[PDB]
From a paper:
In this work, we find that the VgrG2b C-terminal domain (VgrG2bC-ter) elicits toxicity in the bacterial periplasm, counteracted by a cognate immunity protein.
We solved the structure of VgrG2bC-ter, encompassing residues 833–1,019, using crystals of both the native and the selenomethionine-substituted forms with resolutions of 3.2 and 3.0 Å, respectively. Two copies of VgrG2bC-ter were found in the asymmetric unit of the crystal, which could be superimposed with a root-mean-square deviation (RMSD) of 0.1 Å. In solution, however, the purified metallopeptidase domain exists predominantly as a monomer, as determined by size-exclusion chromatography-multi-angle laser light scattering (SEC-MALLS), with a dimeric species also present. The VgrG2bC-ter protomer possesses a single domain composed of six α helices and three β strands, forming a shallow bowl with multiple small loops. A PDB search using the DALI server identified several thermolysin-like metallopeptidases as structural homologs of the VgrG2bC-ter effector domain. Although metallopeptidases target diverse substrates, the overall core fold of three α helices (α2, α3, and α5) and two β strands (β2 and β3) is highly conserved and bears the classical HEXXH catalytic motif typical of these zinc-dependent enzymes, where X is any amino acid. Indeed, the conformations of the HEXXH residues in our structure are suggestive of metal ion coordination, and the geometry suggests that the electron density in the putative metal-binding site corresponds to a divalent cation such as zinc. These features permit classification of VgrG2bC-ter as a thermolysin-like gluzincin within the MA(E) metallopeptidase subclan (Rawlings et al., 2018).
Numbering used by the authors:
A (entry chain A): 833 to 1013
B (entry chain B): 835 to 1013
The structure:
């Protein structure tokens, strides 16, 4: 069983390097670019920290093993699954659907700030599965965003956006002020 | 620590390439020539369907070498330095031996072997665990008791012995390993 852990994690990173090297870098001209409302939505969270020009919404899977009800953001482009296709404007969808979009955008923000969301992601996803680590983040004093895994990083940012839209900036900034910089 | 990691990462990358570009385009590449079918028939006979077999003068993966050849799916992928060969049967005996070696994997694939996974595992295990790549014939050891790669070398070296020293000298040395 501890033999399965090292093996499983390495095999998952190996598969990530393979996909990375194989279909290396996305076609800037392919997909669809962010809408006026979508740029506004993300600007309210990320501001001018990300170049929204780069960001592309592709209604196609990144890999054949990607789920029907799943979304990937490895290269700074967002790949929508079979059940999440046909959305022209994410800013004109439900608050929970908008939250999903802010989540994927955090991976796009990570990528734009020098993070290998493909490798780092594959490693952390496999490590939390086999090493049984808790899926849900737990806020701690002295812990910044960067001390969490790339998926929790997203969950945090999304949950902040949802708190700020549902309970106002007052309630949101009190809880998330520590973790964000 | 590096061994378990390295081997698993190598098999993981193989499953990824396998799942990703799964199965080759039967109509793509180039099919075996009359001479090439004859060449292989003398070794493999009617054990393989030569119709399936396709010679593609393109890399299987970007990390494949200039002086390297891959045969993972029952199609042969030629590297940068091995391109432009219209007929392998009209090339040097050593160049024909290479072709028989690649054909052994094509024969393994056609007989139920996952050349991609089994290969990636064995190649990585032989590198990190520093195990002897070069086969050494042993009594009681059948071809199936050797690496998918050794299996390729054994069959090729047999073909070369049979062409250079005749079937007499070749069949005396290789009769044991082959069935
Ligand atoms: Zn995600
Ligand atoms: Zn080979």
């Amino acid at each position: 069983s501890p033999a399965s852990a090292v093996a499983g994690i390495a095999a998952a990173v190996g598969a990530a390097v393979a996909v990375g090297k194989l279909l290396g870098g996305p076609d800037a001209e392919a997909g669809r670019a962010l809408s006026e409302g979508e740029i506004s939505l993300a600007k309210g969270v990320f501001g001018d920290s990300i170049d929204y020009s780069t960001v592309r919404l592709r209604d196609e899977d990144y890999v054949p093993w990607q789920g029907k009800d799943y979304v990937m953001a490895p290269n700074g482009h967002i790949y929508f699954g079979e059940e999440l296709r046909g959305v022209a404007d994410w800013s004109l969808e439900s608050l929970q659907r908008q939250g999903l979009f802010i989540h994927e955008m955090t991976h796009v923000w990570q990528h734009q700030h020098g993070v290998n969301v493909l490798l780092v992601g594959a490693y952390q996803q496999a490590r939390q599965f086999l090493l049984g680590d808790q899926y849900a983040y737990r806020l701690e004093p002295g812990k910044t965003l960067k001390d969490y895994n790339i998926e929790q990083q997203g969950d945090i940012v999304r949950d902040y956006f949802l708190a700020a839209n549902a309970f106002g900036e007052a309630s949101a900034n009190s809880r998330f002020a520590g973790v964000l910089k």
